[PDB]
Amino acid sequence: LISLSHYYPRQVVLERGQGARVWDSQGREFIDLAAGIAVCGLGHNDPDLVAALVEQAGKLWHTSNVFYSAPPLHLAEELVKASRFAERVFLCNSGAEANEVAIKMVRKWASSQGRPADKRVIITFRGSFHGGGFRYIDFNDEVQLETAMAAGDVAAVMLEPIQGEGGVMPAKSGFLKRVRELCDQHDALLVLDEIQAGMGRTGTLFAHWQDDVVPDMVTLAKALGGGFPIGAMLAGPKVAETGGNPLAAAVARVALRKLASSEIAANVSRQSKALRDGFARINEEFGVFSEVRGRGLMLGAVLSKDFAGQAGAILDHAAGQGLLTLQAGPDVLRFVPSLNITDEEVAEGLKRLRAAIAAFIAAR
Amino acid sequence: LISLSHYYPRQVVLERGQGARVWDSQGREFIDLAAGIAVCGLGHNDPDLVAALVEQAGKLWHTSNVFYSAPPLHLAEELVKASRFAERVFLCNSGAEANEVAIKMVRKWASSQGRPADKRVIITFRGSFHGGGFRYIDFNDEVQLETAMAAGDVAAVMLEPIQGEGGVMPAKSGFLKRVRELCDQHDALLVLDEIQAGMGRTGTLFAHWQDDVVPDMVTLAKALGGGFPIGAMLAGPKVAETGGNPLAAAVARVALRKLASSEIAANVSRQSKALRDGFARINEEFGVFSEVRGRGLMLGAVLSKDFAGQAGAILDHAAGQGLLTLQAGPDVLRFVPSLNITDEEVAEGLKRLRAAIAAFIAAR
């Protein structure tokens, strides 16, 4: 069944899910702490998500931008209101589409400001991977950002509040505030990529609320749809003066409402603490982690000196123990589970994680 | 209800569809000859499409590229086989994503051939709108294409077999064959954008089969999913040596099978003829069309000299008569209905089209 990949990754074919459990094509049960890389915020087979998809599926899937339908219009209004900054939203099909629109919008805004072509530079950060016309500097380095903006050629700073792929590195205290302040001083836009950190995952619906900044643009991907293909670019007043389909929108309206709830934000803190406690117990036994970092349910367990580079090997042992989880570079285990993962699912996932690390050490 | 567009087109909110009929939020019934701009090839609420979506919706929506699921692997195998040229397929979320991957692949291939940066030019054609590093020439002009490739700096020619937006202008006889021959002589790739003309719409599953050429890449959009968000880049042997989700894939497998059927190809020719006959009857009465052009169910009625520029005004009258249809520039009415549109749906659509043109002329 996996031999048809010569036409198209861990050699595991997934068949069905329920919450934070997934079963492969052979009936093996896995605890899922990856949630499709921070996508399935309500786990698999959420009753409200499936009901919404089924209900819209019997009505109308697609209009094109030539005609209107109601779910996208309501989602546009609900997402703009939820964001607490945006005036307009561009609905699209993926985070890649959203980030591309955000970049094009930076350029259109810059030219509308009278910036010549050599003064539309976008600063991005090493470890994040969006992006000529780009300038790469180190994350969390305010002195380096100040230097990089000194020439006046920068039109936007674009960043993730937490660098998911880059070791689950969160913005340090005050960092986004300093970016905001520097963007203001240099008349540049602040673009926040909330594709992984957004949709409730850090414990607030939008991650940057905890950084206490107001951005000019925010991008979102299919976490907005709880796993249904969608993306969005949210635009604040500076750039609003510069589409979607009913199937994705009907589902995203349910995802957006549930993922904004106090219940979800509650579980995020509860299970963040529970995972952090479990990592600490695992660490005291085996000395495998140097630190745990991140926010809410976007966590990175940093492997200790004696385990540098072993993330992939540990992931292999985790699959062998019935646990699906991620890495974030070769030195960090990344955990981005569904935001409604239960106590019992966390407990079993932690049990399997410990088994995996124990097996890795025993095999060395 | 349409006042929430200050957050996000014809001022018509569509609610539900059945085949080639759609109803707006007020219960008005429309004949649909636009099919979401050549997207809903099986019309609205196709039983097989909805059944497939419902069945997959209860299992698993999303894996990420870190894990496998079965529907994408089967779709990859089925699409590669159906294409009669491809060796590999890249599954994505939209035609915009597919065309971007095709362009990046042209560049990677060109560099892997040792082409310096000034010799990776992509020729595209005026009227088509994909696309620095691009060279724009007139469609259907073999002498101009020969001249544009003479310097040896072109890495690919990228074209639609029919220019949907550009007046529904089909490739003239032998044109793609001449492009293929010139690409071969200059060691360049042939990339065919089948987003609008593909998925059975011209009467064969792939439009370029009727041009009797073998391309190096083909791109497809959400017509592959019958209206579910999806896209694909199909790669032949020259570039195969250089993802997807189970929800889109489960639906696209049903769309791909039905849209390849002899029944659908039969209806395309039958209703193409029926639409062409109707346009001719309308034309004799009112003298409104200079010609009808296109292939199968991708048709453009070219407005006559006395109606130059009036496409949009006629579209407005069509909506007032309960008909949704498109234009293709200001001088052409474009018709891209569902490929399983029935005799009775065509007849009623033609009745309303005539009413619309009659009203336009009576109002002048």
CB burial string B19-52: b at 16+ within 10 A, e below: bbbbbbeeeeebbbbbbbbbbbbbbbbbeebbeb
Which residue in the block uniquely carries the two structure tokens 């009625």? B301
Structure-token pair, residue B360: 């336009």
Q: CA distances (Å), B341 to each of B160, B265, B270, B348, in order?
A: 24, 12, 10, 11
- Dist. CA A265–CA B268, nearest whole Å: 53
In this complex, is the C-beta atom of A18 within 8 Å of any C-beta atom belonging to chain B? no
To one decimal place, what's the resolution in Å? 1.9
**Nearest by Cα to B182 from B147, B208, B209, B217:** B147
CB A141 within 8 A of CB A157: no
CATH topology of domain A1-45+263-364: Aspartate Aminotransferase, domain 1 (3.90.1150)
**Whose structure tokens read 């976008």?**
A122
Distance of CA A284 to the CA centre of its chain: 30
Q: Is the CA virtual torsion B97, B102, B105, B110 positive or negative?
A: negative
DSSP class of residue B19 equals: B
Cβ(A360)–Cβ(A320) below 8 Å: no
CB B275 within 8 A of CB B325: no
DSSP letter (8 states) at residue A44? B
- Minimum-distance CB partner of B57 among A34, A50, A243: A50
Query: Which of B299, B95, B308 is closest to B201 using CA atoms?
Result: B299
Taking the CA of residue B175 and the nearest CA in chain A, the distance in Å comes to 30
- Maximum CA pair distance of chain A? 63
Residue A257 one-letter amino acid = R
Q: Show me where the domains of chain B are located.
A: 1-45+263-364, 46-262
Closest C-alpha to B161, from B112, B131, B203, B119: B203
Residue of A nearest to B223 (CA): A62
Q: For residue A61, give every residue at least 6 positions away whose Cβ sits within 8 Å of its Cβ, in sequence order, or none.
A: A245, A246, A247, B40, B44, B226, B227, B228
CATH code of the region A46-262: 3.40.640.10
A6, two tokens: 């010569």
Question: Any CB–CB contact under 8 A between A244 and chain B?
Answer: yes
Residues B239 and B215: their CA atoms lie apart, in Å, by 11
Side-chain-facing half-sphere of A219: CA atoms under 13 Å: 26
Instruction: Decide if A240 touches B, using CB distance below 8 A.
Output: no
Between CA A168 and CA A332 the distance in angstroms is 8
Which of A22, A45, A324 is nearest residue B58 as measured by Cβ atoms?
A45
Compute the C-alpha angle A44/A48/A50, nearest 5°.
60
CA distance A1 to chain B (A): 7
Report how far residue B353's alpha carbon sits from residue B347's, in angstroms, rounded to the nearest whole number: 10
At B285, the amino acid letter reads: E
Give the C-alpha separation, B128 to B124, whole Å: 8
The helix (H) or strand (E) run that includes residue B254 is: helix B246-259
Q: Give dist(CA B159, CA B182) in Å, integer.
A: 14
For tokens 């997959």, what's the residue?
B56
Nearest in space to B100 (alpha carbons), one of B216, B217, B206: B217
Q: B67 to chain A: which residues are within 8 Å by CB?
A: 9-10, 12-14, 324
User: Is A291 labelled as part of a ligand binding site?
Assistant: no
Task: Measure the CA–CA gap between A100 and A94, rounded to whole angstroms.
Answer: 10
Cβ pairs bridging A and B (under 8 Å): 205
Let me know: does A44 contact B60? Beta carbons within 8 Å: yes
Pairwise CA distance, residues A87 & A82, whole Å: 11
Q: Where are the alpha helices (DSSP H) in chain A?
A: 35-38, 47-57, 70-83, 95-112, 142-149, 175-185, 237-240, 246-259, 262-286, 311-320, 343-363
With beta carbons under 8 A apart, name residues in chain A contacting B73.
1-2, 4-5, 7-8, 13
Quick check: B25 and A70 CB within 8 A? yes
Q: Quote the CA–CA distance of B336 and B346 in Å, as a whole number.
A: 12
Answer yes or no: do A1 and B93 touch at CB < 8 A. no
CA–CA dist B346, B349 (Å, integer)? 5
Q: Tokens representing A84?
A: 């607490």
Rounded distance between C-alpha atoms, residue B110 and residue B132, angstroms: 15
Burial (0-12, 13-18, 19+ Cβ within 10 Å), A53: buried
Q: What is the DSSP string of B298-335?
A: EEEEEEPGGGTT-HHHHHHHHHHTTEE-EESSTTEEEE
For an interface test with B, the pick among A25, A45, A56, A64 (most B C-beta atoms closer than 10 Å) comes out as A64
CB B141 within 8 A of CB B149: no
- Between CA B216 and CA B238 the distance in angstroms is 7
Q: Within an 8 Å CB–CB cutoff, is residue A10 touching chain B? A: yes
What Rg do the C-alpha atoms of chain B give, in angstroms?
A: 21
Cβ within 8 Å of residue A268, ≥6 positions away: A200, A201, A202, A203, A296, A297, A339
- Unique residue bearing structure tokens 């299919």: A222
Select from B60, B83, B256, B315 the residue whose CB has the most chain A CBs within 10 Å, as the one to mutate to test that interface.
Answer: B60
Q: Where are the alpha helices (DSSP H) in B84-185?
A: 95-112, 142-149, 175-185
Q: How far is CA A254 from CA A53, B82, B184, B352, in A?
A: 10, 37, 52, 39
| Cβ neighbours of B284 (radius 10 Å) | 10
CA distance A237 to A85: 8
DSSP for A126-141, please give it.
Answer: TTT-----EEEE-TT-
What's the CA gap between B186 and B117, in Å, rounded?
Answer: 17
Q: Residue B4: list chain A partners with CB under 8 A.
A: 73-74, 76-77
| Residue A162: closest CA among A197, A130, A192 | A197
Taking the C-alpha atoms of residue B202 and residue B168, their distance in angstroms, rounded to an integer, is 12
A231 in Cβ contact with A93 (< 8 Å): yes
B98 CB neighbours in chain A (<8 A) are none
Whole-number Å distance between alpha carbons of B63 and A15: 10
Q: Order of strands across the sheet with A134-137?
A: A88-92, A231-235, A217-220, A189-193, A154-159, A121-125, A134-137
Using a CB cutoff of 8 Å and minimum separation of 24, what contacts does A327-330 make? A328/A164, A328/A165, A328/A166, A328/A167, A328/A168, A328/A300, A329/A165, A329/A166, A329/A167
Q: Assess contact for B309 and B296: CB atoms under 8 A.
A: no
Report DSSP state, residue A276.
H
DSSP one-letter code for A171: P
